[PDB]
Amino acid sequence: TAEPPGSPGAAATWTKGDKEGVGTSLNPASKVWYTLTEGTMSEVYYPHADTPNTRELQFAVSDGTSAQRESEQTTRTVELADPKALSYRQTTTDNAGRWRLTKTYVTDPRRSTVMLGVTFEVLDGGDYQLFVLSDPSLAGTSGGDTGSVTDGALLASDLADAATPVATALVSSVGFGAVANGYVGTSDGWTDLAADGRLDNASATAGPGNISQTGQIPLAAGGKTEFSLALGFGADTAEALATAKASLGTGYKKVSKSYTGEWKKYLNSLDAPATSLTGALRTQYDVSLMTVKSHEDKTFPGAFIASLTIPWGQAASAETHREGYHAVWARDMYQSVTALLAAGDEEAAARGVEWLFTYQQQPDGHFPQTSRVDGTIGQNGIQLDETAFPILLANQIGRTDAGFYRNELKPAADYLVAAGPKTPQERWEETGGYSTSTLASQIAALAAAADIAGKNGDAGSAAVYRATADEWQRSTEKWMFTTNGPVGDGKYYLRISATGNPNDGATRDWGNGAGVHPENAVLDGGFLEFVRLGVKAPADPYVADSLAETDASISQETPGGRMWHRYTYDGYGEKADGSPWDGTGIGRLWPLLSGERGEYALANGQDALPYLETMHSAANAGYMIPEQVWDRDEPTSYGHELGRSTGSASPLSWAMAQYVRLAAGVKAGAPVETPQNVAARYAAGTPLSSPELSVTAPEALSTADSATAVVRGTTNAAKVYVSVNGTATEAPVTDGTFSLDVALTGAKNKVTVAAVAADGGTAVEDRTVLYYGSRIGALSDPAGDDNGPGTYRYPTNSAYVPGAFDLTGVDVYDAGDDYAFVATIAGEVTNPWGGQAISHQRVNIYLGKGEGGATPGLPGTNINLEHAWDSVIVTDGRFDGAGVYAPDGTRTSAVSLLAVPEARQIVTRVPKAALGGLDPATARMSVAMFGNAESGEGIGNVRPVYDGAYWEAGDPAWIKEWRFGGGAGVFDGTIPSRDTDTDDPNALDVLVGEGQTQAAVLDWRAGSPVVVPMLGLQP
Ligand SMILES: [Ca+2]
Ligand SMILES: [Ca+2]
Ligand SMILES: [Ca+2]
Ligand SMILES: [Ca+2]
Ligand SMILES: [Ca+2]
Ligand SMILES: [Ca+2]
C-alpha cells in the first residue's frame, strides 16, 4: 500500500498542563473527557479517566494562497457557556479581522462522543476554505496510530494494547469537502496548508506511526456557516463510527441541552451553598464541584484520578505510556470525595470507599502510592497517609459493618500499627521520617479505627489502635516541634524529622535542586492538618507559634490574598528564567494551601471567605484552579503574573476540592470533614488520664524459647491487652500487675501492650520477639573475645567490621523438619562480597557424644576437638561452602543460612535428617569461629593467621590488610596451607566450659594443635 511521505512521523509531546476548561457528562454511559488549551481541544480521555488519546484539534483557514491556524491568532477567548454546566466556548478572530470562529464543547451523555458546535463567519468579501486539524495520540501514545476513511468519516485506531483498544471517528454534520491522512511533520494538514495554502495531500490512509487527519468543511453561501463535529470513541473503528453517527443523528442542540441539563440537575439536587458567596465565588463553587465529580471514572465508579492533565505537557514526550497526573492517588481521592461529601453527594463516597478497599488496597493492608482506575498498581512508594485517608473516609461514611471491618478496615489499621510512626514518604512524595502532615492522618485514622473496632466488639484491637494513636498524639511536639530553628523565635513545627529530635539540626537533600539543608530550616504548613483532623484543639499553642515562622518562611501576599509555598527551598516548579521544571527548578505558590489555611481559620471561628477569594483569584476564565501560580514581580520571557497560573497544571482535582470543602465549612461554621469522634477525643475540652504502664519482660528485642512468650509488668490501669501481629488477647490485671503467656505466630512478632484506664486514657509499649521454635538448649560466650589466644588482630581492611568474628552465643531450636542453629556475634552481620547471608564468617560446630580423645578439626582449621565428632555444621555463606560434613570432608547435607541483623544473628537451618540420629538435645559440641577464605588462600576455606611482627610489618600489603596476625608463620605459595607455620589455631574465638579459659585452651605455645572443649547445650 502506498503511503503519504513522512513515516514514521515526528517525535511528539503532550499538551500544556493548564487547561482552559474540562468536561464530561454526568452520565457514566459516555466514557469521554475533554480538555482545552491554547484555543484548541487538547487531550480527550477514553475509555478511562486515566487514558489520554488526543493532542490537538483545531481549525485552519486559508485564502487559497496562505493558510492560518487559530492557535496563532493573537485574539481568542475562552468562557464557560453555561454557569451550571461544564460546557466551554472558545472564540478565534483573525489578526486582520477577516473571519471569526466560535466553538462550543459538550459531550453526548448517552455515548462516547465529544461534540463541537461551530460557527464560522467570513467578514470579508469571502472566498475562504476551512479545515479541521485533528492530531490524535490514541491509547496514550503518539505513535502506533493508523488513520483511514469510510463513509465520509475520518477513522483512526491503535489496537496495540489488547486491554484498552482505542479507535475514533471524526464526523461533520455537513460532511467533508476534502480529506487527508498524513505523518506529523511532513504530510499532516498544517505542514501541507502552510506551504501553499492548499491541501495537496489526499491520502485515505497513514500509519502506523505519528499521524494526523484533516478535513475540509464545506461552507454555506453568505457570511457564515453553522455545523458541528462529532468525535466518537469505540473499541474499534466500526463502533467509533457508529457512535459518532448516532450523536449527529440526535444533533448538537439536543445533545447539548441534555448534557447541560444533567449537570444543572446534579448541582440543584445537592446542598445549597452559603448565601454569603458572591456571584463569582458561587460560580467558582459550581464549576469546582462539577470538576471534582468529573474526575470520577465511569467504568470503575468510586475511583477518582488526580487530574485530567499532564504537568508541563508540552515538554513531556508522548511515545511511551505515561502516568502524568491522570492516575489514582488515595490522597487526592480523599480530598475529592471529602469535598463531594461536603456538597451532599453521598453515593460517590460510598462507591469511593468500596472501590478503594476492593480494588486498590494491597493484600498486606496498605495502599499503593498510585494505581490505575482498575486498581493495577502504578507507583510503589509507601505513603502512610494514603492508607490512613481511606480509613478516615470509611469513618466519615459509616462503612463499619463487621465484614468490612475484619477483611478491609482491620488489615489497613494493623498496617499502620506495624509501620510505626515514621512514614517513608510524606504527601509531597519525596522524603521520610516523622511528618507532621502524615502523622496527623496516622493518629486520626487509628483513633477512628479504634472506635470502629470497639463498635464491632473487638476490644483488643480497639485498645491497640487507641493506645498507639494516643502515644503518637502526645509525641507530636517532642518529635517535630523545634525550639532552636534558624527562623524567628526558633519555636515552630518543622516539616519532617528523621530522628525525631527536632533540635538536632540533622540535614538531608530536599531534591529538585534544593540541596542540603537542616530539617530545622525547612518549614511546611502540613502541621495545620493537626487541627483539621481533630488531632489538636483549634487553638493548640504549638500549632499557633508555628504560624509566624511558617508565614515568614514560605508565604507571600499576592494581589488576590496571601498564598503559601509547600515548604522552604522547595524546587518543584519553573526555573528562574520562567522555563518549565525538568528535574530542578523553584517551587511556586500552591493555591490549595490558602484553602487549608482557611479551614484552620474557620476552625477558630474566623471569617474564611477571604481565603476563598484568594483561591479564586488564581483561577483562569474557565474557573480552573491551578496547582501553582507565579510568585515574582517580574514576568520572565514567558509572561508570568504574580498570583496567576504558572501554566504547568490546571485544574487540580485536589485544589478544586479544597475550594468546595472550605466553602461548605463556611456555611456550617466549622470544617465539615473533621472526624467528630477523633476531635471529641483530642480537640474537645477535658483531658484524659495517662495511666502508668511498665513492661518488665521481655526486653525491646528478644528471642523466644518456645511458641509462647511471657509478657508481664505493672500498670495502674483498669485493663491491659497484649496484641501480637494484629491478634490481641486480654491480660487480667491483678494488684497493678499482669502476666500473660502470649502465642507467637511468626518468625518476627511485633508485640503491642495497651493499658486502658477507667476513663479511657491509655499507655502503650512495643516489643519485638523472634521465633525459631522450641529451644533445645544454649551456649554462651563473652564479647571482646575475638582475638584467639588473646593476641590476634582482624585484617585491617574496612570490610572486617569490629566484632565480626566475635561469638556471643549459640542457641539451638527444634524448628519442625529442621534444627535451627542460631549463632550470635557482637559485631554487625554484614554481607558485602555478596554471599548467602554472610561473607566473612565461617563458624564450625562439631557434633559428637564425647567419645575418645583429641580429634583434628576440618583441614585449614589447625585445631583439635576434645573428643571425636560424627559431623560438623559449617556456616559459611561464601562459595557454597555451607552444610554438614563428615570427618572425611564429604558434605552429607545442604543447609540454609539466614541473616537477622537487627538481632546480630546468623541462622543455619539444618534438616533433622542431616544429623543421622544424633540428637542435639544430648550431643556434645565444639564451637569455633574462623574467617572464610578462597581455596587458594588456605586449605579448607579458612583465612590463615600469621606471625605478629610479620603481620604488623605490612609487607606485602595484603598480609596486614587481608589476613589475620598475632599468631605464627609467614606466607608460602607452594603448600596448600599458604602458612609456613600451622601450629597456631586459625580460630578467632571458640567456646569453653566452666573452669577453663579461651586464653589457655587456645595457647598453642603450651601444646599443638590446641584442643577445643566439647560441651553440651544447657536447657
Ligand atoms: Ca498511539
Ligand atoms: Ca498523531
Ligand atoms: Ca482489600
Ligand atoms: Ca566471644
Ligand atoms: Ca600460622
Ligand atoms: Ca570465646
Short mmCIF file of C-alpha atoms in Angstrom, two decimals, residues 38-366:
data_model
loop_
_atom_site.label_atom_id
_atom_site.label_comp_id
_atom_site.label_asym_id
_atom_site.label_seq_id
_atom_site.Cartn_x
_atom_site.Cartn_y
_atom_site.Cartn_z
CA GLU A 38 -4.25 27.36 23.72
CA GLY A 39 -7.61 27.84 21.99
CA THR A 40 -7.71 24.22 20.86
CA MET A 41 -9.06 20.91 22.14
CA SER A 42 -6.24 19.02 23.84
CA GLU A 43 -6.30 15.56 25.42
CA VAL A 44 -9.60 13.69 25.35
CA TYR A 45 -9.61 10.74 27.74
CA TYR A 46 -11.28 7.39 26.98
CA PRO A 47 -12.42 4.89 27.97
CA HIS A 48 -10.98 5.58 31.43
CA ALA A 49 -10.16 8.90 33.07
CA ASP A 50 -6.59 7.57 33.06
CA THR A 51 -6.06 7.27 29.28
CA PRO A 52 -5.40 10.32 27.02
CA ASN A 53 -5.92 9.81 23.27
CA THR A 54 -5.60 13.23 21.68
CA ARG A 55 -3.09 16.03 21.30
CA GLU A 56 -4.74 18.80 19.34
CA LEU A 57 -7.87 19.51 17.33
CA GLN A 58 -8.30 22.97 15.85
CA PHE A 59 -9.12 24.71 12.59
CA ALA A 60 -7.08 26.12 9.74
CA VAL A 61 -8.48 28.70 7.38
CA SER A 62 -6.93 29.53 4.04
CA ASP A 63 -7.45 32.19 1.38
CA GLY A 64 -6.19 29.76 -1.23
CA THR A 65 -2.60 31.01 -1.08
CA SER A 66 -1.90 31.48 2.62
CA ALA A 67 -3.26 29.43 5.50
CA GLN A 68 -3.55 30.06 9.23
CA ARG A 69 -4.17 28.19 12.48
CA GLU A 70 -6.42 29.66 15.14
CA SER A 71 -3.79 28.73 17.72
CA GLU A 72 -1.71 31.52 16.21
CA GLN A 73 -4.39 34.22 16.18
CA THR A 74 -3.41 36.60 18.98
CA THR A 75 -7.08 37.28 19.64
CA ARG A 76 -9.08 34.38 21.07
CA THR A 77 -11.26 33.94 24.15
CA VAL A 78 -12.49 31.18 26.42
CA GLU A 79 -15.60 31.30 28.59
CA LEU A 80 -17.90 28.75 30.17
CA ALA A 81 -21.07 28.69 28.07
CA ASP A 82 -23.36 27.83 30.97
CA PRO A 83 -22.98 28.83 34.65
CA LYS A 84 -24.36 25.41 35.62
CA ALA A 85 -22.61 23.02 33.20
CA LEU A 86 -19.09 22.15 32.07
CA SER A 87 -19.56 23.46 28.54
CA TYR A 88 -16.97 25.89 27.19
CA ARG A 89 -16.86 28.26 24.26
CA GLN A 90 -13.66 29.21 22.50
CA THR A 91 -13.66 32.13 20.08
CA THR A 92 -10.97 32.85 17.49
CA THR A 93 -10.69 36.05 15.48
CA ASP A 94 -8.32 36.68 12.59
CA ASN A 95 -5.46 39.04 13.43
CA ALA A 96 -6.78 41.05 10.49
CA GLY A 97 -10.43 40.58 11.44
CA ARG A 98 -11.32 38.85 8.17
CA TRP A 99 -13.02 35.86 9.82
CA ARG A 100 -14.23 34.61 13.20
CA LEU A 101 -14.60 31.07 14.56
CA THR A 102 -16.79 30.14 17.54
CA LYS A 103 -16.56 26.69 19.10
CA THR A 104 -18.69 25.31 21.93
CA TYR A 105 -17.84 21.98 23.58
CA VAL A 106 -20.16 19.39 25.05
CA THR A 107 -20.33 15.58 25.07
CA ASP A 108 -23.11 13.14 24.30
CA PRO A 109 -24.28 11.89 27.72
CA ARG A 110 -25.58 8.64 26.20
CA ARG A 111 -22.48 7.54 24.26
CA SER A 112 -18.73 8.21 23.96
CA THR A 113 -18.71 11.27 21.73
CA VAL A 114 -17.19 14.73 22.18
CA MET A 115 -19.22 17.24 20.21
CA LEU A 116 -18.37 20.65 18.85
CA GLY A 117 -20.88 23.34 17.92
CA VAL A 118 -19.16 25.56 15.40
CA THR A 119 -19.95 28.84 13.69
CA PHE A 120 -17.61 30.20 11.02
CA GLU A 121 -18.05 33.81 9.93
CA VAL A 122 -16.36 35.40 6.95
CA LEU A 123 -16.28 39.17 7.48
CA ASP A 124 -14.56 39.82 4.13
CA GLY A 125 -15.73 39.63 0.55
CA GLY A 126 -15.41 35.93 1.17
CA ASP A 127 -13.59 33.09 -0.57
CA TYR A 128 -12.09 31.13 2.30
CA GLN A 129 -11.51 27.44 2.92
CA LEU A 130 -11.96 25.86 6.36
CA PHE A 131 -10.28 22.65 7.55
CA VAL A 132 -10.33 20.67 10.78
CA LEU A 133 -6.92 19.62 12.05
CA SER A 134 -7.03 16.51 14.22
CA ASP A 135 -3.76 15.15 15.56
CA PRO A 136 -4.52 12.16 17.80
CA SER A 137 -2.33 10.27 20.26
CA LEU A 138 -4.55 7.21 20.66
CA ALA A 139 -4.10 4.97 23.71
CA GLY A 140 -1.73 7.33 25.49
CA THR A 141 0.95 7.13 22.79
CA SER A 142 1.60 9.48 19.85
CA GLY A 143 2.95 6.63 17.75
CA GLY A 144 1.24 3.40 16.70
CA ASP A 145 -1.78 5.19 15.22
CA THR A 146 -3.46 4.45 11.90
CA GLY A 147 -5.82 6.84 10.16
CA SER A 148 -8.31 5.87 7.45
CA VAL A 149 -11.56 6.85 5.73
CA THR A 150 -15.02 5.33 5.32
CA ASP A 151 -18.46 6.73 4.51
CA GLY A 152 -17.25 10.34 4.61
CA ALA A 153 -15.71 9.96 8.07
CA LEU A 154 -12.13 10.18 9.31
CA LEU A 155 -11.24 6.99 11.19
CA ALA A 156 -8.22 6.26 13.36
CA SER A 157 -7.13 3.44 15.66
CA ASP A 158 -4.46 1.97 17.90
CA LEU A 159 -5.32 -1.60 18.93
CA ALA A 160 -1.76 -2.44 20.03
CA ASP A 161 -2.92 -2.96 23.62
CA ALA A 162 -5.45 -5.78 23.77
CA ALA A 163 -6.58 -4.50 27.17
CA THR A 164 -7.52 -0.97 26.17
CA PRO A 165 -8.05 -0.75 22.40
CA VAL A 166 -8.79 2.73 21.07
CA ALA A 167 -10.36 3.97 17.85
CA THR A 168 -12.01 7.21 16.84
CA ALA A 169 -14.25 8.64 14.16
CA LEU A 170 -14.47 12.31 13.24
CA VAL A 171 -17.71 13.27 11.54
CA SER A 172 -19.03 16.55 10.12
CA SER A 173 -22.73 17.43 10.34
CA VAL A 174 -22.30 18.69 6.77
CA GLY A 175 -19.68 16.15 5.75
CA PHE A 176 -16.20 16.94 4.48
CA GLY A 177 -15.25 18.50 1.16
CA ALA A 178 -11.76 17.02 1.04
CA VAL A 179 -9.94 14.67 3.40
CA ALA A 180 -6.34 13.64 4.05
CA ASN A 181 -4.36 11.42 6.41
CA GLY A 182 -0.66 12.08 6.96
CA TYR A 183 2.52 11.90 9.03
CA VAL A 184 3.10 14.70 11.53
CA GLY A 185 5.93 16.96 10.45
CA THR A 186 5.82 16.05 6.77
CA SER A 187 2.34 15.36 5.39
CA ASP A 188 -0.02 16.47 8.17
CA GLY A 189 -2.61 19.12 7.33
CA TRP A 190 -0.84 22.20 8.72
CA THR A 191 2.51 21.32 7.15
CA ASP A 192 0.66 20.95 3.85
CA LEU A 193 -1.62 24.01 4.08
CA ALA A 194 1.13 26.21 5.49
CA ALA A 195 3.26 25.62 2.39
CA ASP A 196 0.90 26.83 -0.36
CA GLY A 197 -2.38 27.48 1.44
CA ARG A 198 -3.62 24.38 -0.30
CA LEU A 199 -4.41 20.87 0.92
CA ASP A 200 -2.40 18.84 -1.56
CA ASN A 201 -2.39 15.53 0.29
CA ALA A 202 -5.43 13.33 -0.33
CA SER A 203 -4.22 10.06 1.15
CA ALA A 204 -7.02 7.98 2.63
CA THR A 205 -4.55 6.20 4.89
CA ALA A 206 -1.44 6.72 7.02
CA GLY A 207 0.47 4.96 9.77
CA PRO A 208 1.05 3.16 11.96
CA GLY A 209 3.09 5.98 13.45
CA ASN A 210 2.52 9.57 14.49
CA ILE A 211 -0.23 10.60 12.10
CA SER A 212 -2.91 13.25 11.88
CA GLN A 213 -6.05 13.83 9.85
CA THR A 214 -7.52 16.91 8.25
CA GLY A 215 -10.91 17.51 6.68
CA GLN A 216 -12.23 20.45 4.71
CA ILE A 217 -15.58 21.74 5.92
CA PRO A 218 -17.91 22.81 3.10
CA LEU A 219 -19.05 26.38 3.78
CA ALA A 220 -22.52 27.86 3.21
CA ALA A 221 -23.39 30.67 0.80
CA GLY A 222 -23.41 34.00 2.57
CA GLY A 223 -21.41 35.28 5.52
CA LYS A 224 -21.45 32.36 7.94
CA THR A 225 -21.76 28.63 8.19
CA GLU A 226 -23.06 26.61 11.11
CA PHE A 227 -22.12 22.99 11.68
CA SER A 228 -20.97 20.51 14.30
CA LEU A 229 -18.37 17.82 14.66
CA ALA A 230 -18.76 14.53 16.49
CA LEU A 231 -15.61 12.77 17.66
CA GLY A 232 -16.68 9.29 18.69
CA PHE A 233 -14.70 6.62 20.53
CA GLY A 234 -15.02 2.84 20.49
CA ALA A 235 -13.03 -0.37 20.92
CA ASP A 236 -12.82 -0.48 17.12
CA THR A 237 -13.32 1.63 14.01
CA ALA A 238 -16.84 0.34 13.32
CA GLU A 239 -18.08 1.13 16.83
CA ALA A 240 -16.44 4.57 16.88
CA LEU A 241 -18.07 5.45 13.56
CA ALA A 242 -21.49 4.14 14.59
CA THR A 243 -21.33 6.01 17.88
CA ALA A 244 -20.29 9.33 16.33
CA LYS A 245 -23.08 8.98 13.78
CA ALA A 246 -25.70 8.33 16.46
CA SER A 247 -24.68 11.62 18.13
CA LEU A 248 -25.06 13.57 14.90
CA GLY A 249 -28.37 11.76 14.43
CA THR A 250 -29.64 13.30 17.67
CA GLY A 251 -28.00 16.62 16.83
CA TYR A 252 -25.81 19.15 18.64
CA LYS A 253 -28.59 21.32 20.11
CA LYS A 254 -30.42 18.30 21.55
CA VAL A 255 -27.28 16.62 22.94
CA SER A 256 -26.11 19.99 24.26
CA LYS A 257 -29.32 20.63 26.20
CA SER A 258 -29.16 17.07 27.53
CA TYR A 259 -25.54 17.50 28.66
CA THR A 260 -26.17 20.86 30.31
CA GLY A 261 -29.40 19.57 31.81
CA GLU A 262 -27.74 16.69 33.64
CA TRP A 263 -25.27 19.00 35.36
CA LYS A 264 -27.93 21.57 36.21
CA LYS A 265 -29.93 18.83 37.92
CA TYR A 266 -26.90 17.41 39.73
CA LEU A 267 -25.94 20.80 41.21
CA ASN A 268 -29.54 21.70 42.04
CA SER A 269 -30.02 18.40 43.89
CA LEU A 270 -27.02 18.95 46.16
CA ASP A 271 -26.75 21.02 49.35
CA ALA A 272 -27.33 24.73 48.79
CA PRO A 273 -24.07 26.68 49.29
CA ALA A 274 -23.57 29.54 51.76
CA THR A 275 -25.69 32.54 50.85
CA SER A 276 -22.68 34.72 51.66
CA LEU A 277 -20.96 33.55 48.48
CA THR A 278 -20.70 36.41 46.00
CA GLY A 279 -21.66 35.74 42.39
CA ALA A 280 -18.11 34.84 41.33
CA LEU A 281 -17.49 32.73 44.41
CA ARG A 282 -20.69 30.82 43.71
CA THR A 283 -19.86 30.16 40.06
CA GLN A 284 -16.39 29.03 41.20
CA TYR A 285 -18.07 26.73 43.70
CA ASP A 286 -20.32 25.29 41.00
CA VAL A 287 -17.52 24.74 38.47
CA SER A 288 -15.14 23.33 41.11
CA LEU A 289 -17.87 20.93 42.27
CA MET A 290 -18.64 19.65 38.76
CA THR A 291 -14.92 19.34 38.06
CA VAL A 292 -14.34 17.18 41.15
CA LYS A 293 -17.26 14.98 40.10
CA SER A 294 -15.79 14.81 36.59
CA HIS A 295 -12.62 13.22 37.96
CA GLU A 296 -14.56 10.11 38.87
CA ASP A 297 -14.15 7.22 36.46
CA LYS A 298 -17.23 5.79 34.71
CA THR A 299 -16.05 2.19 34.27
CA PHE A 300 -14.95 1.93 37.90
CA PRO A 301 -17.41 4.12 39.84
CA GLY A 302 -15.84 5.35 43.06
CA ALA A 303 -12.36 5.74 41.57
CA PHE A 304 -11.01 9.28 41.19
CA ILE A 305 -7.99 10.27 39.12
CA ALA A 306 -5.88 13.17 40.43
CA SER A 307 -6.14 15.40 37.37
CA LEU A 308 -7.12 15.23 33.71
CA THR A 309 -3.74 16.63 32.78
CA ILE A 310 0.00 16.17 32.28
CA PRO A 311 2.19 18.73 34.09
CA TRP A 312 4.41 20.69 31.69
CA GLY A 313 2.86 18.52 28.99
CA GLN A 314 4.40 20.46 26.10
CA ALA A 315 7.77 19.09 27.24
CA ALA A 316 6.58 15.57 28.01
CA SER A 317 7.25 13.11 25.18
CA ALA A 318 4.23 11.03 24.19
CA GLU A 319 5.90 7.98 22.60
CA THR A 320 5.72 5.88 25.76
CA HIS A 321 2.82 5.20 28.12
CA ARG A 322 2.95 7.96 30.74
CA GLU A 323 1.16 8.43 34.07
CA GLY A 324 1.13 12.22 34.30
CA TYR A 325 -1.46 13.28 36.88
CA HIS A 326 -4.20 11.16 35.30
CA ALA A 327 -3.98 8.24 37.74
CA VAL A 328 -5.50 7.33 41.12
CA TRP A 329 -3.83 8.65 44.32
CA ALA A 330 -5.55 7.70 47.57
CA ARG A 331 -4.72 11.15 48.97
CA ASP A 332 -6.24 13.29 46.19
CA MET A 333 -9.24 10.97 46.08
CA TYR A 334 -9.72 11.58 49.79
CA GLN A 335 -9.73 15.30 49.02
CA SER A 336 -12.25 14.73 46.21
CA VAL A 337 -14.82 12.55 47.99
CA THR A 338 -14.47 14.57 51.16
CA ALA A 339 -15.40 17.63 49.06
CA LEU A 340 -18.31 15.83 47.38
CA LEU A 341 -19.39 14.67 50.83
CA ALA A 342 -19.41 18.32 51.90
CA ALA A 343 -21.71 19.18 48.98
CA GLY A 344 -24.13 16.29 49.52
CA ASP A 345 -23.05 13.54 47.12
CA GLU A 346 -23.16 10.53 49.46
CA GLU A 347 -23.31 7.94 46.70
CA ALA A 348 -19.90 8.93 45.30
CA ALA A 349 -18.33 8.49 48.75
CA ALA A 350 -19.88 5.05 49.27
CA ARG A 351 -18.62 3.94 45.86
CA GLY A 352 -15.27 5.53 46.62
CA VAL A 353 -14.76 3.69 49.91
CA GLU A 354 -15.84 0.43 48.30
CA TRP A 355 -13.50 0.83 45.31
CA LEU A 356 -10.54 1.83 47.46
CA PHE A 357 -10.64 -1.27 49.66
CA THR A 358 -11.76 -3.67 46.98
CA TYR A 359 -9.54 -2.56 44.09
CA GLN A 360 -6.56 -0.51 45.29
CA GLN A 361 -5.81 -1.95 48.71
CA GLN A 362 -2.88 -4.37 48.60
CA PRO A 363 -3.11 -7.79 50.30
CA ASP A 364 -0.87 -6.68 53.19
CA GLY A 365 -3.33 -3.93 54.10
CA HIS A 366 -1.62 -0.76 52.85
#
